Amino acid sequence: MNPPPPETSNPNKPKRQTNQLQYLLRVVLKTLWKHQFAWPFQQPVDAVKLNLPDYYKIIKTPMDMGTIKKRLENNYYWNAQECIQDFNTMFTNCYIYNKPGDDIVLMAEALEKLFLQKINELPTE
Numbered sequence: 620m621n622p623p624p625p626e627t628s629n630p631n632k633p634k635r636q637t638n639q640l641q642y643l644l645r646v647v648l649k650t651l652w653k654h655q656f657a658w659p660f661q662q663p664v665d666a667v668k669l670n671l672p673d674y675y676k677i678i679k680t681p682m683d684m685g686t687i688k689k690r691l692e693n694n695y696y697w698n699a700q701e702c703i704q705d706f707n708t709m710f711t712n713c714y715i716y717n718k719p720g721d722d723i724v725l726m727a728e729a730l731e732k733l734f735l736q737k738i739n740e741l742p743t744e
């Protein structure tokens with residue numbers, strides 16, 4: 620079966636607004652979210668629905684842009700690097716589970732390239 624999705628809230632964890640976090644939501648995440656190849660990454664992998672019973676045997680640190688979006692929207696991240704790390708985990712997972720030439724790998728590559736292009740313009744903190 621599926622695990623519960625990653626937490627999108629931490630109670631009593633303090634909260635802040637920063638230019639970097641705003642940029643991560645309204646520029647980086649927004650741009651990736653709207654890309655033609657975003658759809659496979661907009662929610663947790665549903666291994667039951669997609670019939671991938673080994674997925675969560677292999678991937679022990681799941682991440683997706685749906686989770687990242689909700690973390691940003693709920694001020695779950697204090698440091699920009701926490702968010703950048705989540706993006707990195709998402710892409711890495713795709714290369715762990717899938718093979719060269721797979722459609723999902725081509726899509727992750729395109730999204731990762733776009734991610735790098737937008738993170739290049741991240742404001743200073």
Ligand SMILES: CCc1c(C(=O)Nc2ccc(F)c(S(=O)(=O)N3CCOCC3)c2)[nH]c(C)c1C(C)=O
Pocket residue numbers: 658659660662664669671712713716717723
């Ligand atoms: C290859 C499986 C996979 C996906 C993926 O999502 N495949 C997918 C297949 C069929 C679909 F229909 C949709 S869907 O986006 O349209 N969809 C999801 C929400 O419910 C409605 C339908 C998505 N994503 C990742 C990271 C991986 C792997 C194994 O790495």
